[PDB]
Amino acid sequence: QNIDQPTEMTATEGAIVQINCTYQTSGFNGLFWYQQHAGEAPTFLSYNVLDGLEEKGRFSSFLSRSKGYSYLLLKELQMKDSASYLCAVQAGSYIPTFGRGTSLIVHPYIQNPDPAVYQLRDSKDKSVCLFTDFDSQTNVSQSKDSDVYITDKCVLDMRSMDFKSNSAVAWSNKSDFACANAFNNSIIPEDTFFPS
Amino acid sequence: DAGITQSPRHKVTETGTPVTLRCHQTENHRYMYWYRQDPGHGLRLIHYSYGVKDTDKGEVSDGYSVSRSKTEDFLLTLESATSSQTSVYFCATGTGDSNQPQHFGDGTRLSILEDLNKVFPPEVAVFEPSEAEISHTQKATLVCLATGFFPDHVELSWWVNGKEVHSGVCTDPQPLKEQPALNDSRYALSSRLRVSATFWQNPRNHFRCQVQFYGLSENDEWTQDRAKPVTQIVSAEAWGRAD
Fold first, then answer.
1. What is one GO cellular-component annotation here (chain A) (predicted)?
2. A130·B141 Cβ contact <8 A
């Protein structure tokens, strides 16, 4: 079915995103879109066999048979839309062929950014560094060495406070390591709070 | 859920071991399917069934067999597991129609290793909130680190006063390799739980990070000094502290 779709896309909550898929097949019998949250089950979003734009709530699906082109359009993007989106093209048995999937990363809108880098101390190695409360435009490397580990960013939602925040964690087993230098190979805000 | 269950949900075993994965459904669909999902690939069909005792091959059938002795079950067998059969396996069911979707299970992570001495459970530690965060923001972020585990078959949860919490939590979607250039490197995974400063400032509040690791079982051979890395929960905890 010659299916192609992008590996990854990023968008901000509240925005519109278009996930594009191309295919070429004899005996076209329809195109499906599925959503797949990281391990678990893919779930059906849409089926299109006739040309045109079909609307289903916040999501729309378009097909052009002559171009062998479909897109899934997500409006009013939500954090819960972070997932992979799979294009599948129908179809001895009606079994669609699945595309490789497009991973969509949704960034939160941070109303009151307060970038800071915090040391925190075992309970019971001995410490980690927490870079937190930065705006979603901030990119976190991936360390230079070797002896130090830096996670990707993670968005938490304090639901009752209607409050979301980004963070990344860094640590090392080595003696030289300090939180002041932990995120050096990242471009971090100049006014980044480093206590104390 | 939607009636589809896969068993086991996780498995790690040695090359040459026979492995059977079971897909069970409730909706009595005529068709069942087994897929594998590998990085850089879409779901790829291994085998499918179009009725009781009726099965046929998919694109990646080599190394697998299936059985459909009854409507409700579709069994996938690896007669002698190979390392290349390490994957995430998804079953699905459906009516077989051109214009209706398939219904999927939640998947099974299967790790097949030449050497079981690569299998390690996590160590887990909880890092208490920074007093500087508390003063600057009136919030308190705990961090959990789960370190040194292999394979990546873990589930991390937070428990506050004996009840699982989800609000204010974020767990890394992917683990990091502790030695990125080493084959079968052990992994680390972090999670955060953020609460209000007042909630942290209660010595009666108990915060626990739990990691369930899926490991070896009775039929796997073990000859190392260290404890056999069986399926197990490893946990760490902290208590709040009065202001």
1. T cell receptor complex
2. yes
